[PDB]
Design a protein around this ligand. Sequence first.
Ligand code: CLA
Ligand code: CLA
Ligand code: CLA
Ligand SMILES: CC(C)=CCC/C(C)=C/CC/C(C)=C/CC/C(C)=C/CC/C(C)=C/CC/C(C)=C/CC/C(C)=C/CC/C(C)=C/CC/C(C)=C/CC1=CC(=O)C(C)=C(C)C1=O
Ligand SMILES: CCCCCCCCCCCCCCCC(=O)OC[C@H](CO[C@@H]1O[C@H](CS(=O)(=O)O)[C@@H](O)[C@H](O)[C@H]1O)OC(=O)CCCCCCCCCCCCCCC
Ligand SMILES: CCCCCCCCCCCCCCCC(=O)OC[C@H](COP(=O)(O)OC[C@@H](O)CO)OC(=O)CCCCCCCCCCCCCCC
Ligand code: HEM
Ligand SMILES: CCCCCCCCCCCCO[C@@H]1O[C@H](CO)[C@@H](O[C@H]2O[C@H](CO)[C@@H](O)[C@H](O)[C@H]2O)[C@H](O)[C@H]1O
Ligand SMILES: CCCCCCCCCCCCO[C@@H]1O[C@H](CO)[C@@H](O[C@H]2O[C@H](CO)[C@@H](O)[C@H](O)[C@H]2O)[C@H](O)[C@H]1O
Ligand SMILES: CCCCCCCS[C@@H]1O[C@H](CO)[C@@H](O)[C@H](O)[C@H]1O
Ligand SMILES: CCCCCCCS[C@@H]1O[C@H](CO)[C@@H](O)[C@H](O)[C@H]1O
Ligand code: OEY
Ligand SMILES: [Ca+2]
Ligand SMILES: [Cl-]
Ligand SMILES: [Cl-]
Ligand SMILES: [Cl-]
Lengths: 334, 97, 38, 137, 50, 51, 51, 30, 37, 34, 34, 243
Amino acid sequence: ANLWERFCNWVTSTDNRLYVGWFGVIMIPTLLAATICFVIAFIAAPPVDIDGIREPVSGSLLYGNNIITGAVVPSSNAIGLHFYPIWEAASLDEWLYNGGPYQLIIFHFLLGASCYMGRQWELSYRLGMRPWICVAYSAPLASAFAVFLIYPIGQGSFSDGMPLGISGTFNFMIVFQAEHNILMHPFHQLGVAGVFGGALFCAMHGSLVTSSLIRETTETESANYGYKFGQEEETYNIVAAHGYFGRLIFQYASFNNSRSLHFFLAAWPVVGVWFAALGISTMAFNLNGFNFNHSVIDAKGNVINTWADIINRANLGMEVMHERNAHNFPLDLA
Amino acid sequence: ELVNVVDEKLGTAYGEKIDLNNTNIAAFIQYRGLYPTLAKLIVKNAPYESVEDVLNIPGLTERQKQILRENLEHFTVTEVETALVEGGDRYNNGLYK
Amino acid sequence: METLKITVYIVVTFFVLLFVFGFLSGDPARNPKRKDLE
Amino acid sequence: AELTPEVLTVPLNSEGKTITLTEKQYLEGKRLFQYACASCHVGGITKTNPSLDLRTETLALATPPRDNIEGLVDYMKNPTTYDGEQEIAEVHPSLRSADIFPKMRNLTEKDLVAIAGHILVEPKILGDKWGGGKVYY
Amino acid sequence: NPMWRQGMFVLPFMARLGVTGSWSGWSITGETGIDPGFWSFEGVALAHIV
Amino acid sequence: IPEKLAFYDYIGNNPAKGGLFRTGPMNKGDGIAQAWKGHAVFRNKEGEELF
Amino acid sequence: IPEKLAFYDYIGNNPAKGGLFRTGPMNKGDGIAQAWKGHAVFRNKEGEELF
Amino acid sequence: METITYVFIFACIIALFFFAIFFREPPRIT
Amino acid sequence: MEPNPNRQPVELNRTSLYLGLLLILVLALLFSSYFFN
Amino acid sequence: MEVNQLGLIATALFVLVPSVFLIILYVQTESQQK
Amino acid sequence: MEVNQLGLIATALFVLVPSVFLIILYVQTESQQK
Amino acid sequence: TLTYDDIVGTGLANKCPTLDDTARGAYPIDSSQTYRIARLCLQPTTFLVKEEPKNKRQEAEFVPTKLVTRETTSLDQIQGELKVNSDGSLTFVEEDGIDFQPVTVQMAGGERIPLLFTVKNLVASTQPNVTSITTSTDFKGEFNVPSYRTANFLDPKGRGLASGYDSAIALPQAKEEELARANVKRFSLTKGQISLNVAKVDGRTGEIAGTFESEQLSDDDMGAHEPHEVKIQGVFYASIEPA
Ligand code: CLA
Ligand code: CLA
Ligand code: CLA
Ligand SMILES: CC(C)=CCC/C(C)=C/CC/C(C)=C/CC/C(C)=C/CC/C(C)=C/CC/C(C)=C/CC/C(C)=C/CC/C(C)=C/CC/C(C)=C/CC1=CC(=O)C(C)=C(C)C1=O
Ligand SMILES: CCCCCCCCCCCCCCCC(=O)OC[C@H](CO[C@@H]1O[C@H](CS(=O)(=O)O)[C@@H](O)[C@H](O)[C@H]1O)OC(=O)CCCCCCCCCCCCCCC
Ligand SMILES: CCCCCCCCCCCCCCCC(=O)OC[C@H](COP(=O)(O)OC[C@@H](O)CO)OC(=O)CCCCCCCCCCCCCCC
Ligand code: HEM
Ligand SMILES: CCCCCCCCCCCCO[C@@H]1O[C@H](CO)[C@@H](O[C@H]2O[C@H](CO)[C@@H](O)[C@H](O)[C@H]2O)[C@H](O)[C@H]1O
Ligand SMILES: CCCCCCCCCCCCO[C@@H]1O[C@H](CO)[C@@H](O[C@H]2O[C@H](CO)[C@@H](O)[C@H](O)[C@H]2O)[C@H](O)[C@H]1O
Ligand SMILES: CCCCCCCS[C@@H]1O[C@H](CO)[C@@H](O)[C@H](O)[C@H]1O
Ligand SMILES: CCCCCCCS[C@@H]1O[C@H](CO)[C@@H](O)[C@H](O)[C@H]1O
Ligand code: OEY
Ligand SMILES: [Ca+2]
Ligand SMILES: [Cl-]
Ligand SMILES: [Cl-]
Ligand SMILES: [Cl-]
């Protein structure tokens, strides 16, 4: 076998401790670059003029931040959606002032995570598995795209992409509520049904299976030792589990089919989160949450507030305070 | 000793009337006939040593002079405050509704 | 900066070519079961 | 509280004459105002120049007075700056500029009266909300 | 206020053999606008980490 | 006289004036040196220079 | 009016004004109280009392 | 000290990733 | 993987633990004044 | 008193790290068979 | 920054005490007769 | 004859027009004629900042910096009166234009220095008896330097001069005095000085170009700290016109 053939065989080998593969060939350097730049920046990057008004915001640890406040700060509003790689700056100092690290990191990462999805397909293929774990992964991925790429495209600037930091994330969420009323958006509501529901179903499955474990151990040892890796027998009694759950609610509200059940467990949070992603991705083009501001009116025409109007007041506080020196004209249009 | 000059100016006639030397142009909407024509002339030809000097703006029609005369009681003049007149802020001071 | 740009361009092209030519190198056949997929 | 004849009685002219609008006229007024004006004047403010609102006090201090039906109808025909000094038909919708503001083309005298009445009545209902802007939402 | 007043211990060993500049533009001889190349103090440090 | 030279002629920079548990930089002791004050010449009432 | 009484009428002694990670005694916050400054009465130019 | 602490904990976590992965107890079939 | 034949079990008996702890605690009791300074 | 602010953590780690080393060694000795 | 001075010793013991607990249990488990 | 699409993204937009090397002529001043500068352009090529020495008795020098706010530095489309004075000197009176730019440059070690690079209200005069503007003509004058932030500017804790909190609300019971300088915003207004040395002259078109050096204070963050001294050097272009 020639060198290229050997190399292909290695890359796609099922025996590597961590699978490489062709998606891996792109994934590994891009993820490494994004990771290294992210760590260095998070520790040591100088303040970044996120909103392009010469008002640099400090994100790194060495420059006054802790873990909760720190961030890799989004690139300058002056840049908008322009491609700002290192070689477009006159110097690393300019590059840093303008938030270059953010673009390097989020582009390398979006590419790398995409290739992560693909790689999940690839290994499933090499191992003779069914292919759709990558489809489940597409939901968190879609979300990442929504907040790092799509929302910036729609708003015309990577300066409005989600910051790489904990407090930065909260900042993103609050400004988002101010301008899109995302809480009142049915796709976000489906996303909440997705993760609340995912949590519920996680606890439920976990507890039903744990509740029906077949006795294989003594009271002085962990029950986990009653399962052995690769045993062909199932480790819990699903008939007993279904008897329980079916009696908890009623019989036909419960799954007797493990395949159907696990498919449910995959489908609910994945679809919900798909809708979360699409919610962000469409509010990216300012199709916003429901607006029932002043929707109820009495016989004279007096406004009768509902809880929606209280929400509106909170949003107003957020709106008027956010980026307090960045607007010169009355409408915040992006 | 440190002073906020705008707060301090609120304690002068500036806090009581339209200051021909400092006040943002939107204020001239308060009274009949001042905005936008006279307001623009007034801000343009500022500052003024006294209120009546507003009458000496070159080119004023008699009607305009009458309207000004009618509104002198609502005017004042104080020293030009740099903080209020820089940045084109007399034309737009960052306030809308 | 121009050296950095050229460098990155060469690197990216290298890995991209690896990806493409890799997936062109009889990939359907690289599975446990049926290999004749041409 | 009800939308009474008293609420719907507004100044016709500057000389103390009033006119009482019907409820149909009020609804027509709201509809036509939304149709031709709300894009800029939603809630009684002015988006392209917030310094001037549609509050009755503001319209009263305008030249010529605009706090009555005849004033508002005239404004919709031949709008002026606040001091009356410039005719601004070329940048503000009016019957006179129906050619460049095409939503004005199908507005009848009746329509102008309804719109006028809406502008005058709505502050009587909403108080400071009218012309208030977001502070009063 | 040279390094030896500041409790600096490896900085002088870097300087002794020719590493005198920062990527940030200063030098220990107090010059400005110097380009130390990759082998700044930061470059040396990074090298040792790798 | 260069400030640097004068600074060498000061016992706070003598490495044999420290303490085993006096930790940290020399600046933490006598301070961050700002400026030479100049040379002090002492004289008595009769104008004799004293050392 | 007893200073102790006045001191109860002060929000710095309200147990609902704290923080989960604001550690230690109340004195570490607003300080160690020394004395009542006395009751403040505000008036405008017309001499109306304001609250 | 804060920065040193944060980075130190992070570094320990990364080392932990390394041992958890390459020096895990190997799964064995029965 | 062939097991390494050079491996050896390690021991610390209880008396050694008491001696060690004593050494550490007494060293600490001695040097701590100087650490606080 | 104005003590060195690192005296506390220094003393604590001075005690704990080698004490813990010894406790590990001792306990793994006791748990060996025989 | 004017951080809390106990923060360091707090974080240090918070990590070290339970980690050390786990290390002791693990090591004495390994040394038990295989 | 370049169009906007020729120029966009190239960096030329931040550059002033140049004159050919042949432009070493004379542009006659008719003392009975009134004149205007139809366009004054100033393109800075270097920003130097005066270091602040510790002994306060050392010779402080101007040291170079790194521009980090990119090609956003030039003043342009500036116009104004060009008065012919009694003694034959000319005086440019700046009326309007794009006559300020916020600029941030970075010192070695990372200290960032923002300034309002400007010639706002420039009044600048030549030597007496300028019958013709030549390569020996020079202008010298003074300008205003207002606060780098104007009065509505709010700091990160929401404090400002014409708007904002007037205290440190996150420290409800701190003592006010120590925070006074940060709480009470002030609006600086200082003077700068500039020289223009004409290097080229097209006597036919009345165009002139040359070098300039200006000196002014930098940002003082609405009174929170002391400004730095800045020296700006670059090239300038001006079109002279009968008016
Ligand atoms: C897997 C390898 C890999 C990939 C895909 C990337 C990708 C990227 N790098 Mg990174 N980088 C890498 C490894 C990689 N990097 C390594 C190892 C280093 C250290 C040397 C770096 C150091 C680095 C720096 C310092 C920077 C980047 C930047 C970038 C971005 C711009 C690159 C560019 O302009 O190329 C353009 C080159 C081409 C378009 C030529 C390729 C032509 C091929 C043959 C065909 C075209 C492909 C086609 C369009 C799409 C493929 C189709 C597909 C289905 C097969 C891009 C996200 C920049 C950035 O992040 O800016 C914000 C940046 O500043 N990289
Ligand atoms: C070759 C060794 C060496 C030397 C000469 C220096 C020198 C210096 N260091 Mg560096 N350093 C070193 C290694 C060294 N360092 C190491 C390994 C580390 C990581 C821990 C550091 C981390 C470090 C930091 C974080 C700092 C320094 C600083 C300094 C400066 C002040 C030192 C000081 O206050 O000491 C004080 C010395 C003592 C108090 C003596 C300790 C004696 C021990 C405790 C005795 C132990 C006895 C033992 C328990 C008995 C056993 C008995 C048994 C057998 C029976 C000085 C230039 C400081 C500086 O100014 O930086 C800008 C500073 O902040 N160093
Ligand atoms: C009933 C419990 C209790 C209460 C209500 C108090 C109340 C008080 N203490 Mg006392 N104290 C206590 C027990 C208590 N103490 C104990 C057990 C000790 C021995 C350590 C002390 C030793 C002590 C000292 C040395 C001092 C006090 C002081 C005080 C005063 C300040 C309180 C403060 O700042 O807390 C701050 C509270 C927090 C920061 C909350 C911590 C929350 C923890 C970290 C959460 C843990 C999360 C966990 C890891 C999650 C795991 C998740 C997992 C299951 C998955 C206050 C009156 C101070 C004082 O003013 O003295 C005059 C003072 O100096 N206390
Ligand atoms: C004082 C007086 C009057 C006293 C009277 C007392 C008395 C005797 C009354 C008798 C009369 C009487 C009963 C009256 C009732 C009145 C009445 C109608 C009360 C209603 C109360 C009420 C609100 C009920 C709500 C019920 C409710 C919300 C049910 C939840 C519905 C729901 C979403 C179910 C989810 C079903 C579903 C598809 C789940 C899938 C996800 C999941 C849990 C997977 C986990 C899983 C499942 C398995 O299946 C097995 C196998 C395994 C492995 C496993 O992982
Ligand atoms: C700041 C700048 C710094 C730049 C640093 C650049 C570092 C690159 C050089 C690294 C050289 C050594 C690496 C070896 C490590 C290793 O994995 O070996 C472990 C095994 C053993 O290799 C096996 O090795 C075997 C031979 S032998 O055992 O090694 O002798 C061989 O037979 C087998 O085929 C082979 O797979 O290797 C593999 O499993 C195959 C390759 C796995 C590649 C993993 C990288 C994935 C990174 C993803 C991104 C994560 C980023 C965030 C992480 C928190
Ligand atoms: C970078 C940071 C690294 C951190 C790791 C630090 C780990 C350091 C651990 C060192 C502790 C060693 C303790 C061994 C303690 C110990 O095991 O002792 C007993 C030990 C006996 O060993 P044997 O050969 O009998 O083997 C028994 C085995 O069980 C021991 O493994 O003797 C020695 O270890 C030699 C030195 C003993 C010296 C101890 C004498 C102490 C006397 C009391 C002193 C205080 C009182 C003074 C009064 C004035
Ligand atoms: C719809 C037909 C419509 C009406 C009616 C209307 C009324 C109106 C009035 C009465 C004024 C004067 C307000 C006052 O004196 O206080 C006024 C002023 C302005 N408007 Fe208007 N307006 C209608 C429509 C529109 C639309 C669609 C816009 C936006 C494009 C608009 C905007 C303005 C502006 C600007 C002014 C201020 C004009 C000035 O004085 O310079 N109006 N409008
Ligand atoms: C940047 C864009 C690039 C676009 C390139 C478009 C190219 C179009 C023609 C591609 C030619 C494909 O040529 C491809 O490469 C080599 C040629 O030695 C072969 O190489 C491979 O063969 C077998 C196929 O089972 C593999 O197991 C083995 O690992 C490898 O040697 C591929 O089987 C062949 O199909
Ligand atoms: C912050 C403080 C950090 C301090 C950390 C110090 C870590 C100390 C590491 C101690 C490691 C002990 O190493 C441990 O040795 C024992 C023997 O003693 C080995 O045990 C082996 O030998 C014994 C013989 O008695 C057998 O019973 C056992 O079946 C066998 O596995 C363990 O496989 C090994 O894990
Ligand atoms: C792992 C990071 C690699 C970064 C390499 C940056 C090279 S930078 C380059 O290096 C030369 C040698 O030092 C210098 O002579 C030259 O002036 C400098 O521009
Ligand atoms: C291993 C790479 C570590 C990252 C290097 C950090 C940037 S370098 C750093 O920059 C600061 C601001 O300019 C300077 O004040 C400081 O002196 C300098 O060391
Ligand atoms: O929300 Mn509000 O809208 Ca999207 O731009 Mn306009 O102000 Mn700003 O740049 Mn970040 O943020
Ligand atoms: Ca010359
Ligand atoms: Cl914000
Ligand atoms: Cl804006
Ligand atoms: Cl108003």
